Design a protein around this ligand. Structure first.
Ligand SMILES: *Cc1cc2c(cc1C)Nc1c([nH]c(=O)[nH]c1=O)N2C[C@H](O)[C@H](O)[C@H](O)COP(=O)(O)OP(=O)(O)OC[C@H]1O[C@@H](n2cnc3c(N)ncnc32)[C@H](O)[C@@H]1O
Ligand SMILES: *Cc1cc2c(cc1C)Nc1c([nH]c(=O)[nH]c1=O)N2C[C@H](O)[C@H](O)[C@H](O)COP(=O)(O)OP(=O)(O)OC[C@H]1O[C@@H](n2cnc3c(N)ncnc32)[C@H](O)[C@@H]1O
Ligand SMILES: *Cc1cc2c(cc1C)Nc1c([nH]c(=O)[nH]c1=O)N2C[C@H](O)[C@H](O)[C@H](O)COP(=O)(O)OP(=O)(O)OC[C@H]1O[C@@H](n2cnc3c(N)ncnc32)[C@H](O)[C@@H]1O
Ligand SMILES: OC[C@H]1O[C@@H](O)[C@H](O)[C@@H](F)[C@@H]1O
Ligand SMILES: OC[C@H]1O[C@@H](O)[C@H](O)[C@@H](F)[C@@H]1O
Lengths: 576, 576, 90, 90
């Protein structure tokens, strides 16, 4: 560890690693700090689901997720426990228990909001779904020129997609995937298009997908090394970044105050360029700790001078969920090309197809897989092979269906894992809404309570807006009920429901992007630079100022690439 | 990865790590293979609970545990789901689903039994409780000389305790720990002693304990290196070990069959010495897959010729659990030295005590801690400080109370963490019973069903022996109800219950030790050498042939230490 | 029709459940493996609790039930009395 | 006839129930029979069902019915947690 780098990056998630990739590559002296630690194995910041053991027990990985989602603001509990023994100590009031947040209104919270503090952040557990936003969901990068704005986004997404190894072909050979994808394509003929979810992942075998992460973007090894002898990069885990120090003029950052968690010592680090990519919650916390915006419960009598839109216009997506059990008709359509005779397990039992026949509904690879499973496992009443991969289906956001969809099997299950129904039959449904940015919807930080790292306690003041947001959220719910029904009836224990506000972890707009700080009520410009500040940049979904339903990360990355370009154009690397 | 090694060790758990420490240190060329992969961070095989994040968020670690406990034998499920939509495909029978084990009788199972496949094994998540066994639970290392037996065990235990860094004072400054322990010793009026659970751990600060693990025993770094230039060690993760090749006379092992899970390739690896430390389940599986004992459902009247006691006499402990809410009486006593005036939160309120007053029931440092908490947080109605450590109390197994006890807070929570009751009030109780070895209690492996790694499927045939084991189990439950009531009544939602059989993961006796293969119905001698084989040693809790209630790992390690002494006496390390 | 139920409509679910006796309960196959070791424990899923060994659990009307009180089920019914249109009607 | 524990955290004035009922095609395979060995509590032959909702129009309509309740109920408000759309026991 030196005291002077060219660039300091706060956060080793995939957005901090986008900045590391671009700047370590362009030959800057780069430092990166994460409050969390290295755990994912020898590949630093890698996806935790890439072990052989998880690929053979996909059902277990829900635990890894839950292990690293630390709630952001837990309100005070008011459940009444009146079956305590008379000898047991019993409250007189509903006092602040268990580090809960006294500032938090329970009825205006994002209870499901949570943060991950591990090297590689949330990209160590994420689903890897990486769709682009269409214009309606998307911030403008060029005004008064739609083709040029389209042009700019298409170049940035293509590069981002490249970093993530995004693709749409990894599940092309799955029976469940094709079955579900097929039905939907037919039921919505002329109304909606379906495709495989664009996934940041590369298939290595029929039973192993290598999921992308921050590690895929930047491998997080210290440089130089044999492989990159001309590069300079250091990662510093177990270091809390607490403040960036403003000059009085509010035109530069002077240093980064860090707290080393192992030794306990606090240090000041100098950079030319300061990049904050600590997540949509923790960027904002860090800026408010540094004198931006306002600390404490909002006071509209006294709005802040510096960055007054900070932690206002926050957006979170509504999320609906269910599971279905495959319809008998769909199960039967799996074997529509077969001539089946006799009874399974009985001497006369016969399953045949004509390869290549004109009347066939399925390709041969399909019918070969089904015929062999049906003949070789006559104890099993289904035509789907045991290790057939799950579906990965979406119909993407459009004006007539303004929500994102994911259909398949997500590793983030929400209830106890049920065993009485065959997993081959189960399909998950997650629809995500777009939330209108409104000034009243706030992420603020307490001037009295602190969190576990002795930083001001995050508090939400949030309701989904009563108008179009709420109407769309309910229409979205009905749409999932309508659509899922095409595949099968609901699985009991996983009936259609809205998830806890924020469980979906797509918070944006906490440090929002736009052209003009005042006119567009924002905090950063289109180079991701904090207005007024020559050398302070924010990356992540906190930048995204629009109402979006699709998963944000690729859009964030896309903004971070544009932001690296401005840095390469305006700061010179130190000579070796 | 070479053709040939002095020693190969299967399994990188703490026991395999005991062999690596001893044999690498003694100059042998050591290879160690683990089916799982590196995932504890840069300290290979280290406890996953040693992150700052987990020590600030101890309730989340239950998820890390659950994520890596993969159930051993799951029977076929027979739950009726009759609220499916009429359109959903519906079972006509309870067919084999979701990888269940059709050999498994659901009513003679250890359903809670589970395995961990990661480098460092279960030591990456364990509670680090390392009690010694008293004579009554301890297998003999010397017959007919209780003095030499004792001194042998004292010496092996003292060594294992330093390897693990066991100690008994890391929690001595907790108010809760002391409140609970003092009240118990008062109430038992001499009949039983309460102490700190001996813990493999080192305290680093008032808020961080470096838990021990495999890595504390042996750091698992490849060697030679700068810190050990004369040593020789390679770890090969993601390598499934499948067979040891016996010579036909059953007097030696010739090679070990391995499957490289990344490349898919298979190799036979040669060494002078072969050490199986794959766990109590997997050592037996590997051995059975190699022609020892009997593959398939046990057949009485066909008995195996080679190690006929392998997989018989299995033991698993009964585990009872509850939590309590601390008594008003105990909460009042924490503050018994205080003069308290006025009402909390008024300008009038004050809490004082006299330091050094001879009538004080508590030391100054306690009273200081209570005073500060009570004066600095007058919103809080409890006298216990916010990050006061949990209790870590035990009364150790004895003949008139033949079960091990642990009282405090265990990371491995068994239901949803409740938020209505303050955590400072909650104390956990786990009592562990001892199970008679009986021949009918079997771990065996299917000759038709295979597991996730294509190895014969583990199947249990187990009931708690009627008679002593079962009478003690129930007296144990009653003892927990009786003892726990001294501290507080039960916490609703954590009422006194037996846990699922084998949830406690203290399986023993699957490859058990004894003097004489026939007379003692066993598999390994007191050097942990498999009878008749020059160069095959088994390590782990599977060696332990006795009825025990204490946590078995320190004992298993002590035996390994004895086994390594045999090795250094009978194999020369190769020239460097 | 009592004053007390008209003032506590929420309670009347209990009167209903009190007089719906299941018609055919199949044999239970739930596995209770946290019984104490001293407690008597089945070796098989035998016919318990008057359940019906003849009943296929997967081809049942489990929710079917009968009321044996004077006035039968009309002592608790919802009183909804629509006519069938031709398509529903004999 | 409520089906789950009575919830109190939401005002009863806001709660609306939805029950949609399907028509079932009569099929010969769907039977109510009586055991010649087991008896019920009045020493009469034990009722046994052999029943599945017919795979064709009955089942299609039942699922369309479910979707119809989801579509229609939405006009009034969102689902109450603990009373999410579900098929009741047959
Ligand atoms: C957890 C989760 C997340 C996503 C999906 C599923 C689940 C279970 N699936 C997924 C997501 N997004 C996608 O677009 N597609 C989907 O398939 N999920 C969200 C996604 O995972 C995030 O949007 C993404 O990582 C955001 O990246 P980022 O902006 O780089 O932020 P991270 O949270 O990954 O990393 C931040 C980081 O910095 C640290 N930190 C925080 N505060 C500090 C301070 N004060 N000092 C130092 N370091 C700090 C963290 O520890 C962390 O590593
Ligand atoms: C999970 C757990 C277990 C312990 C406690 C708490 C919980 C939640 N706490 C506890 C324990 N015991 C104590 O003595 N005190 C306590 O506080 N727990 C049990 C303890 O953790 C085990 O007894 C101990 O690890 C056993 O050590 P081991 O004999 O070294 O075996 P492990 O299972 O840890 O490691 C085995 C290992 O080998 C692998 N494996 C399995 N099969 C193969 C094959 N075929 N090839 C290659 N490698 C194989 C594993 O992947 C593993 O790492
Ligand atoms: C319980 C229930 C029932 C109905 C609704 C709600 C609930 C909770 N709501 C309702 C109904 N039907 C409507 O059209 N609209 C709705 O709003 N429910 C059903 C309705 O309640 C029944 O369809 C109706 O009573 C049928 O009348 P029934 O054909 O007269 O049959 P009952 O079951 O009322 O009375 C039969 C009767 O005879 C007895 N019994 C049975 N076996 C014997 C023998 N062997 N010996 C002598 N007596 C016998 C009974 O004890 C009973 O009183
Ligand atoms: O709740 C899980 C969901 O979380 C979201 O963060 C992801 O973007 C989705 F892919 C995922 O299915
Ligand atoms: O189930 C958790 C328990 O599991 C056991 O393996 C441990 O030995 C105990 F320490 C622990 O409390």
């Amino acid at each position: 560890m030196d005291i002077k780098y060219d660039v300091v990056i706060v956060g080793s998630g995939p957005i901090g690693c986008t900045y590391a990739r671009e700047l370590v590559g362009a030959g800057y002296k780069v430092a990166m700090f994460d409050i969390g630690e290295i755990d994912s194995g020898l590949k630093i910041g890698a996806h935790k689901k890439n072990t052989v053991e998880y690929q053979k027990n996909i059902d277990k990985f829900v635990n890894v997720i839950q292990g690293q989602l630390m709630s952001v603001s837990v309100p005070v509990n008011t459940l009444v426990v009146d079956t305590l023994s008379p000898t047991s100590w019993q409250a007189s009031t509903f006092f602040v228990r268990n580090g809960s947040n006294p500032e938090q209104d329970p009825l205006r919270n994002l209870s499901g909001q949570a943060v991950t503090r591990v090297v590689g952040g949330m990209s160590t557990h994420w689903t890897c779904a990486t769709p682009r936003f269409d214009r309606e969901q998307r911030p403008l990068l060029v005004k008064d020129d739609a083709d040029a704005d389209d042009a700019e986004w298409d170049r940035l997404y293509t590069k981002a997609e490249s970093y993530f190894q995004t693709g749409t072909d990894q599940f092309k050979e799955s029976i469940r995937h094709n079955l579900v994808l097929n039905k939907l394509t037919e039921e919505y003929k002329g109304q909606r298009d379906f495709q495989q979810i664009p996934l940041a992942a590369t298939r290595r075998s029929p039973t192993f997908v290598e999921w992308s992460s921050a590690n895929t973007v930047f491998d997080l090894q210290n440089r130089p090394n044999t492989d990159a002898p001309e590069e300079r990069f250091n990662l510093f885990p177990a270091v809390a970044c607490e403040r960036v120090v403003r000059n009085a003029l509010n035109s530069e950052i002077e240093s980064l105050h860090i707290h080393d968690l192992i030794s306990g010592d606090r240090f000041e680090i100098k950079a030319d360029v300061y990049v904050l990519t600590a997540g949509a919650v923790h960027n904002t916390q860090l800026l408010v700790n540094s004198g931006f915006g306002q600390l404490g419960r909002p006071n509209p009598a006294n709005p802040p001078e510096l960055l007054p839109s900070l932690g206002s216009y926050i957006t979170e997506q509504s999320l609906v969920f269910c599971q279905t059990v495959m319809s008998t008709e769909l199960i039967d359509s799996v074997k529509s090309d077969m001539t089946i005779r006799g009874t399974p397990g009985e001497l006369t039992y016969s399953v045949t197809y004509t390869p290549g026949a004109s009347t066939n509904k399925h390709p041969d690879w399909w019918n070969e897989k089904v015929k062999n499973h049906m003949m070789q496992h006559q104890e099993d009443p289904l035509p789907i092979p045991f290790e057939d991969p799950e579906p990965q289906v979406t119909t993407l956001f459009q004006p007539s269906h303004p929500w994102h969809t994911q259909i398949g099997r997500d590793a983030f299950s929400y209830g106890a894992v049920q065993q009485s129904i065959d997993s081959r039959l189960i399909v998950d449904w997650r629809f995500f809404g777009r939330t209108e940015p409104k000034e009243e919807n706030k992420l603020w930080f307490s001037d009295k309570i602190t969190d576990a790292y002795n930083m001001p306690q995050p508090t939400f003041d949030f309701r989904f807006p009563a108008g179009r947001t709420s109407k769309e959220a309910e229409d979205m719910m009905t749409d999932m009920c309508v659509m899922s029904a095409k595949i099968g009836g609901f699985l009991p224990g996983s009936l259609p429901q809205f998830m806890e506000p924020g469980l979906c972890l797509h918070l944006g707009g906490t440090h929002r992007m736009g052209f003009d700080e005042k006119e567009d009520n924002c905090c950063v410009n289109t180079d991701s630079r904090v207005f007024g500040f020559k050398n302070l940049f924010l990356g992540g979904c906190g930048n995204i100022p629009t109402a979006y339903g699709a998963n944000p990360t690729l859009t964030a990355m896309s903004l971070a690439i544009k932001s690296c370009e401005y840095i390469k154009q305006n700061f010179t690397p130190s000579p070796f």
